[PDB]
Symmetry: C3
Subunit: 332 residues, 3 copies
């Protein structure tokens, strides 16, 4: 009887940050209420000024990370304002039935809908738009995110002991397919609908023009680099709704990794690089041991350094010479 | 002494169906006899009427699923009728030695051969044609299938308890590389041999023109959708002999998954999407909990919805509102 | 106090061979000293005579395999002779901090440097050059290798029992992106620097022109085929610093496989094919049971047989008819 359960309303935050939550559940099962507003918007995705018409949940690419516990109910109010132009919906990979909710959430501009599902399987999971006949166009225009369903007793290592993170970040990785003219220059369009047949052609090459974290080349750098301190335990949730990726922390490891993101399985230990298949979210746990700049990349290094799939961590603290040291500095 | 073992002759069935077998072995080890006839045939692979010269085992793409138990012997009579034009052979990934049988089964048109091997490792495994110097051309023209070697005591979950399936389907996923003219139109040829150098060029792009289940765009839809009922336990065996895929059941999960297909390993639990590497067969177990239409896709959604790698399940039974419900239907 | 530890100097060998080492550590922790000299050189990579300017560690592609034990210290003297033209460095995925050593090892032509790091995690790991702003160009010109950090008590199976190998080989798999003219012919350049902007363009296609083992099409064939005898236990270490691969031993299996290369995890058993993600090293253990020629391939068979990712094993010993036999040889 869902009417007797507590309701809690969560206000979402912009990636790569994640809304406040408890790791170990401090209440019984709840109905967790979220609201998302769909926003079609122009986005500049690279240093050259290339512009696309992005399709977003809550204004960002990726959409925000939702966090619940196993056997909570997720109730999402999804709003498609009349300032948009397309029909949208939502498919949660966490959910069971009706194409993950997709069959029940088709909203034209000026409509809203409220969906409820029970979060029966713990893990991180992708969610994405999936309108009949235009599924890859919406997804590859940015209309995807993830949801984390924590076990009620939090995360566990390969021996069943508790793993507690101090910080959590969400990296959404996006493959874009910007149409090109004859000579290879990117095309601009005034409306999303203009791009349609050119988008289909660009997608069928299976070759992205850009692969980015958090919606743009260089988004997780400079003032927007991820931060941590030596000794901190960090969980990085990484999703890719359409195409395989292989995350790597340059200068670190994945101490505990759930590459396909499902927490009833034991983690893989000591990973250098891990494969997250397209249509999946994964999670990696690392304890920082050295200060400085780290790069977090898709380790197809062309995809990283030429197409955009690279961000930075900036880590403060004390250097440990026992782990690494320069014995003789570069000299002639 | 193989002469004292029982022989049993199995008549194969067309994918996605699978020949009758017992999960738990009801006899001791047997010599299991199969016959396959090679058929080169014209195939229409898409809605536009694109035609290729396919190279098939037993008339289908994929070839049929063979099912034995661990430590049975597989005896295959392979027939290459004189109405074909090419030399063919067979390589079983399940077998040990002689290039998986490939070195011993080279049959010109008008020849046959009988191979026997011991099925020493349990799992699902790819088989494919692999003639010296033309291996990828045969495989990517459809000349591949799979064999399942069950443990004698059937399948087990991660705790070693029995898993029994009620139904089993075989999805063979095929990457095709149809040659194109200058403008991008598909070429037609009168014989398989005509296509050869154009096929090599198309393959070297590493970009398929079509990726299909069961030999054509839309093959596992409509009247040919897969079926199940709420409460049924379904095993889906999925192979890809040449290129990685990432299956996903839209609206469901892989409750127990052997992504690389080998049953002495514990399954991965609660998977949203899993990676089957090219040259591998995998298997996923799911118990249906909700009725309706499900889509089973490669979750590179371009490969699914633009290139053809999507099929449907149609599931009958009772809707469970506790798992999912529309609280407020789309409305303005 | 590192000054009181034993030092040992290791002389490296050319892949696919591996320098002598003990599986089970016969000493306490040591400082293990290696020297590598960077060599930019012209390399012929295919039968047609296509030439590239390769960037190598110690003259080979891949660079040599280094072998230490967990909690040894690795001290590498890296030398960039003044006959080279570019700045280079080294990033070890095995190491913790400073971009895996990359930030501390930038050597112009005519410089050297000595780096020390503690090998705290057991596994096989990639190392590669990674100079600021030109990372994929160096890596995809051949400037990568691997390091194996053995547990002090050697390798273990899924039940924690010892696994001892009789022979070990190192297969480095390399994706090359040779620039092409308008018609599709490969370009030649006099110096590495000439190629730069053409290399970036070729890389951005994400489509390699060649994928090779040990630096050339056919390198591990003929007189240079890998060898073993029936009954021998062979460990094959395989790396790919930039792009996913899916190794398969044609006619065999991976009896015990660490696909992502980290030995605190239990191995996967009975693998037909396994995925090594780009930026990773993996390891497979197999006991040969049948004599003859085996092919070891990336099982995207186009990448194998058209682009070059195939080698051979030649195995001596006795044929076992119980495992496989021709019952009726090909006949009309
Ligand atoms: O405002 N662009 O959808
Ligand atoms: O856009 N309707 O709430
Ligand atoms: O599905 N693309 O890796
Ligand atoms: O192929 N996915 O990077
Ligand atoms: O070691 N990072 O490419
Ligand atoms: O899917 N579990 O890593
Ligand atoms: O009949 N075509 O091979
Ligand atoms: O085609 N010979 O049986
Ligand atoms: O091997 N192709 O994913
Ligand atoms: O790259 N395989 O879809
Ligand atoms: O959730 N299916 O793409
Ligand atoms: O290969 N076993 O999933
Ligand atoms: O000698 N070529 O770098
Ligand atoms: O090249 N300096 O040792
Ligand atoms: O990262 N390329 O498979
Ligand atoms: O996509 N890697 O073969
Ligand atoms: O079975 N080798 O492709
Ligand atoms: O990463 N261990 O296979
Ligand atoms: Cu949408
Ligand atoms: Cu999906
Ligand atoms: Cu054939
Ligand atoms: Cu094969
Ligand atoms: Cu370099
Ligand atoms: Cu790296």
């Amino acid at each position: 009887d869902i009417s007797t359960l507590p309701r809690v309303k969560v206000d979402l935050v912009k990636p790569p940050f994640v809304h406040a939550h408890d790791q170990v559940a401090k209440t019984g099962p709840r109905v967790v209420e979220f609201t998302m507003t769909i926003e079609e918007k122009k986005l500049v995705i690279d240093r050259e000024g290339t512009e696309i018409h992005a399709m977003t949940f809550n204004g960002s690419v990726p959409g925000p990370l939702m966090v619940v516990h196993e056997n909570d109910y997720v109730e999402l109010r999804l709003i498609n304002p009349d300032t948009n132009t397309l029909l949208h919906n939502i498919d949660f990979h966490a959910a069971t039935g009706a194409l993950g909710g997709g069959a029940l959430t088709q909203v034209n501009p000026g409509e809203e809908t409220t969906l409820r599902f029970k979060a029966t399987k713990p893990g991180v999971f992708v969610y994405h738009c999936a309108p009949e006949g235009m599924v890859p166009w919406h997804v590859t225009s940015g209309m995807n995110g993830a949801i984390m369903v924590l076990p009620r007793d939090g995360l566990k290592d390969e021996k069943g002991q508790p793993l507690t993170y101090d910080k959590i970040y969400y990296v959404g990785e996006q493959d874009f397919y910007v149409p090109k003219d004859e000579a290879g220059n990117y095309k601009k369009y005034e409306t999303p609908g203009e791009a349609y047949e050119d988008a289909v052609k660009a997608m069928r090459t299976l070759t992205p023009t850009h692969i980015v974290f958090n919606g743009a080349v260089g988004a997780l750098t400079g003032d927007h680099a991820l931060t941590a301190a030596v000794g901190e335990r960090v969980l990085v949730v990484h999703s890719q709704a359409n195409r395989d990726t292989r995350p790597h922390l340059i200068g670190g490891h994945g101490d505990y990794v759930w590459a396909t993101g499902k927490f009833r399985n034991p983690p893989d230990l000591d990973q250098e690089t891990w494969l997250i298949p397209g249509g999946t979210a994964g999670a990696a746990f690392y304890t920082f041991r050295q200060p400085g700049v780290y790069a977090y990349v898709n380790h197809n290094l062309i995809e990283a350094f030429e197409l955009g799939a690279a961000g930075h961590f900036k880590v403060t603290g004390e250097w440990n010479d026992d782990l690494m040291t320069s014995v003789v500095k570069p000299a002639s």
